[PDB]
From a paper:
As an alternative to mAbs, we previously computationally designed two classes of minibinder proteins that block the [name]-[name]-2 receptor binding domain ([name]) interaction with its host receptor, angiotensin converting enzyme 2 (ACE2). Here, we sought to develop constructs containing three minibinder domains that could simultaneously engage all three RBDs on a single S protein, and by virtue of this multivalent binding, potently neutralize [name]-[name]-2 variants. The second consists of self-assembling homotrimers of minibinders geometrically matched to the 3 RBDs on a single spike; although [name] is lower affinity than LCB1 and LCB3, and the sites targeted are less diverse than the first class, homotrimers of [name] have the advantage that the ACE2 binding site is inherently less mutable as the virus must bind ACE2 to infect cells.
We also hypothesized that constructs with binding domains containing different sets of contacts with the target epitope could prevent escape. To design multivalent constructs, we started from optimized versions of the previously described LCB1, [name], and LCB3 minibinders (hereafter referred to as monomers MON1, MON2, and MON3, respectively). The structure of MON2 in complex with the S trimer has not previously been determined. Starting from the TRI2–2/S6P cryoEM data, we improved the [name]/MON2 densities using focused classification and local refinement, yielding a map at 2.9 Å resolution enabling visualization of the interactions formed by MON2 with the [name]. For [name], we similarly observed several mutations, including K417N, E406W, and Y453K/R, that reduce the affinity of the minibinder for the [name]. Two mutations, Y453F and E484K, improved MON2 binding, consistent with MON2 mimicry of the ACE2 interaction interface.
Author numbering:
A (entry chain K): 1 to 75
B (entry chain C): 333 to 527
Write the structure that this text describes.
């Protein structure tokens, strides 16, 4: 369930980034819009690709992003 | 008897993208709803305002059938009082919606080896949709204060995004076909009745 495990976190990023599009203003909003787009783009590369190392790299980046987004949500 | 063409709604060879859902108007025909609600091929069959087993004794002026393809995990957004990527930017239902939401898995049709990327949804929008509103604009979205001038690039995005549908996807992100049946009663004679 490695492929599915990664999707889980990529969706979480897109969902939080989406909610923030109605809350943030200025640079904070622009940043959230990027992360939203990134997650939904990576969901397409996750499926198309191969090699476990690429799959884990995506997950690690996605997790850093999700934690980052929560710093905007709490403020 | 002239039965309503539900076979052209459900057994359609092609379904529209969620950002540009296809509406068919059903009118002046006999609507048998016991054919759909007994097939046991649908994963979702949820009726609001009308009971599925009482549906057949009611007459309406028009019945609208809105069809589109989304992910399994996004089916929950096709309901009253919901928010999310689909509910807000692609397909919005009213809080007082009267009708039925029917959905089923189309993993054997809308998925391809290598990934089926022909289905799209709206990723960005300036504001949320009103009930039964559609938006098929492809104008570039400006994320910040920097003007795009219609050019995609840094802080400028193409408003639509594709789905990646393949046979081996997890259930949550397998493709699902959704048909929403909206029932309206106006002042007109009410020509859509069941048997
Ligand atoms: C949508 O189509 C299904 C299946 O129709 C059959 O297969 C098609 C590919 C084509 O060959 C059709 O001519 C076939 O009839 C319908 O399900 C059937 O419904 C009939 C009538 O109730 C029933 O006797 C069959 O056993 C059903 N077959 C299966 C596999 O369930 C379905 O009713 C159609 N939907 C609508 C709204 O008409």
């Amino acid at each position: 369930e490695l492929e599915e495990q990664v999707m889980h976190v990529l969706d979480q990023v897109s969902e939080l980034a989406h909610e923030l599009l109605h809350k943030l203003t200025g640079e904070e909003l622009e940043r959230a819009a990027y992360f939203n787009w990134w997650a939904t783009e990576m969901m397409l590369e996750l499926i198309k690709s191969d090699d476990e190392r690429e799959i884990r790299e995506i997950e690690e980046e996605a997790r850093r992003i999700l934690e980052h987004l929560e710093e905007l949500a709490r403020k | 008897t002239n039965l309503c063409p539900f076979g052209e709604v459900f057994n359609a060879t092609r379904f529209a993208s969620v950002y540009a859902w296809n509406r068919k108007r059903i009118s002046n025909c006999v609507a048998d709803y016991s054919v759909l609600y007994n097939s046991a091929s649908f994963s979702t069959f949820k009726c609001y305002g009308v009971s599925p087993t009482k549906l057949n004794d009611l007459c309406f002026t028009n019945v609208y059938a809105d069809s589109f393809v989304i992910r399994g995990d996004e089916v929950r957004q096709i309901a009253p009082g919901q928010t999310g990527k689909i509910a807000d930017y692609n397909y919005k239902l009213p809080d007082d919606f009267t009708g039925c939401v029917i959905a089923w898995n189309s993993n054997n049709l809308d998925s391809k080896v290598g990934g089926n990327y022909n289905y799209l949804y709206r990723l960005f929008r300036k504001s949320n949709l009103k009930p039964f509103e559609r938006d098929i604009s492809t104008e570039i979205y400006q994320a910040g204060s920097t003007p795009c001038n219609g050019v995609e690039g840094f802080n400028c995005y193409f408003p639509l995004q594709s789905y990646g549908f393949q046979p081996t996807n997890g259930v949550g992100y397998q493709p699902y076909r959704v048909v929403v049946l909206s029932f309206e009663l106006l002042h007109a004679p009410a020509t859509v009745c069941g048997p």
